[PDB]
Design an enzyme around this catalytic site. Structure first.
Site, mmCIF file in Angstrom:
data_model
loop_
_atom_site.group_PDB
_atom_site.id
_atom_site.type_symbol
_atom_site.label_atom_id
_atom_site.label_comp_id
_atom_site.label_asym_id
_atom_site.label_seq_id
_atom_site.Cartn_x
_atom_site.Cartn_y
_atom_site.Cartn_z
ATOM 1 N N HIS A 156 0.809 8.449 3.862
ATOM 2 C CA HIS A 156 -0.114 7.702 4.744
ATOM 3 C C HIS A 156 0.625 6.553 5.442
ATOM 4 O O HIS A 156 -0.029 5.908 6.282
ATOM 5 C CB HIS A 156 -1.381 7.303 4.008
ATOM 6 N N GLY A 172 -0.417 -3.568 1.367
ATOM 7 C CA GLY A 172 1.054 -3.579 1.407
ATOM 8 C C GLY A 172 1.688 -3.119 0.097
ATOM 9 O O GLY A 172 2.903 -2.891 0.133
ATOM 10 N N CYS A 207 1.175 -0.291 -1.479
ATOM 11 C CA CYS A 207 1.307 1.182 -1.527
ATOM 12 C C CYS A 207 2.792 1.534 -1.621
ATOM 13 O O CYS A 207 3.642 0.839 -1.058
ATOM 14 C CB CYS A 207 0.601 1.868 -0.370
#
Ligand code: U0M
Ligand code: U0M
Lengths: 304, 304
Positions: A41, A143, A145
């Site tokens: 993503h 942030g 991830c």
């Protein structure tokens, strides 16, 4: 003496964290050898996230669209592929700090350390368990991830988790390092409800053994039980069923303390039925389930 | 979202841990520049520990009696001195992994990370607070002496703690890196009783703010109080008195949540008086006091 929720030392993983940027999305990547692993993503706009077609979105991306920064030095991306829900960015430089490592897919109830990171920079380390509903209860802001979960065996890092998303209930979902989600979760901004967060019984028993080893013994009682009898109580209290496999795994703690596993089950049964009556065990007012039997042995024996 | 007991990433400290052996005693040392810091009781036999005269014991020790091993490589000791309760071993090699660092003496209520080590090898990392009685509740087995406590500010490690001993009650005592004990403790195997382990009120309030930010709000009530009124309740419950300095420090969390500090004090007062009635806050059945206001801001804002 003393018993603490303890994370693995994070240095070996710190040396692997990088920043990945695609368009205006920045998150964390894991640099091992000449591959950077990150959530797919990274290629999405928050608009894309509502119903992304990742194969279609990825067609629009070239190697040079993936900006990979390791400290304040840029890595050259020479290839990219999607494996399940992760991107693998091939870079022209092997990470010189690559530790001995493996990728493992853990079972529910297994514990691991998380190195929470933002923009490729480590912020903190804490100890998690894969919940029986395949969520984790982490601490992840925007942030984070691409932050990873890991175990360390002497000098070998086993990576088990990469962070992908927060459910609307504020629990966390992610993948193994082959990009397969734990549980039924998808990397889409849609309604995804977690199932029952049951208590990891074998971990509670391990932690009760840890308590006895450390001098917290008030909850030991005169009773025993059977697996079947204990399991009726477990079901009532949304505890995982205890198997003979779990009894076998607790054998060394049984041996060390001289408390039969089924006796400790009877202690746990009374704690479930009676509560703690305002008392504490290892500084907790609830029964802790994020220590595995292996964790308790390790901490109680001092493995490095 | 989510709120975890989080340690600093430990890599910078991992690079500083060494093994120190004197005669048959092995413990951990901290290698910064060309100095190794370790507990002075490295020079004691367990017999010596009952009533050691450290100056007299140290006369019998030469540089070559201090064996300092960094990984599997021996460091050459070219000087040694005693500063308070630590030895400083001058070695011929500056630690190439020396981070930016400072030595700080922390106040009671301050939190820090511990890198538990055995034979110079990191085993785990966890988050501690200096208790108001100047003990810490750690996880330390035999061989963990010389393990250190630290905070990290961007790239600067502030070392605040070196582990020296366990009290007969299984709580921990240690020094700053100038070798001065926290509290009244001495490095002698004698009766040393800790004072009252009071609750760090300002930390509990910080953690209540963290809870509200993370959606745990059930304990917010319709009341307010005064510092004097709250403090009468605090005294009754063995909580530290709250000062205007503490109120000032909680100002940013007050501002972010729009809950006045004295309103949160009134919520805490009701929780002290009524208990949790079997409810939890951020997955705890008791009021957590090992997060500072700075900790809560950091974790809630994502500082690296
Ligand atoms: C770009 C992004 N915009 N939001 C993000 C966080 N979440 C949202 C839910 C599902 C995930 F996989 C990622 S990534
Ligand atoms: C040699 C040693 N033998 N025991 C040790 C642990 N403790 C005991 C109490 C007081 C300390 F400072 C050290 S060190």
């Amino acid at each position: 003496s003393g018993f603490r929720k303890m994370a693995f030392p994070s240095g070996k993983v710190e040396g692997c964290m990088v920043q990945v940027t695609c368009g205006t999305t920045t998150l964390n990547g894991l640099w091992l050898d000449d591959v950077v692993y990150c959530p797919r993503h990274v290629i999405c706009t928050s608009e894309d996230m509502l119903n992304p077609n990742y194969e279609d979105l990825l067609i629009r991306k070239s190697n040079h669209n993936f900006l990979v920064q390791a400290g304040n030095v840029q890595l050259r991306v020479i290839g990219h592929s999607m494996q399940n829900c992760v991107l693998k960015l091939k870079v022209d430089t092997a990470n010189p700090k690559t530790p001995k490592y493996k990728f493992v897919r853990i079972q529910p109830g297994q514990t691991f350390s998380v190195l929470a990171c933002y923009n490729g920079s480590p912020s903190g380390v804490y100890q998690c368990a894969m919940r029986p509903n395949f969520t984790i209860k982490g601490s992840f802001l925007n942030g984070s991830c691409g932050s990873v979960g890991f175990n360390i065996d002497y000098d070998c890092v086993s990576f088990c988790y990469m962070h992908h998303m927060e459910l609307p209930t504020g629990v966390h979902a992610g993948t193994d390092l082959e990009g397969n989600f734990y549980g039924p979760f998808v990397d889409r901004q849609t309604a995804q409800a977690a199932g029952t967060d049951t208590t990891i019984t074998v971990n509670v028993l391990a932690w009760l053994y840890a308590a006895v080893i450390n001098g917290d013994r008030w909850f030991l009682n005169r009773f025993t039980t059977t697996l079947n009898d204990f399991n009726l109580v477990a079901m009532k209290y949304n505890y995982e069923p205890l198997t003979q496999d779990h009894v076998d795994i607790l054998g060394p703690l049984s041996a060390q303390t001289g408390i039969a596993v089924l006796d400790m089950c009877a202690s746990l049964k009374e704690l479930l039925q009676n509560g703690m009556n305002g008392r504490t065990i290892l500084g907790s007012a609830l029964l802790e389930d994020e220590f595995t039997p292996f964790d308790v042995v390790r901490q109680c024996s001092g493995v490095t």
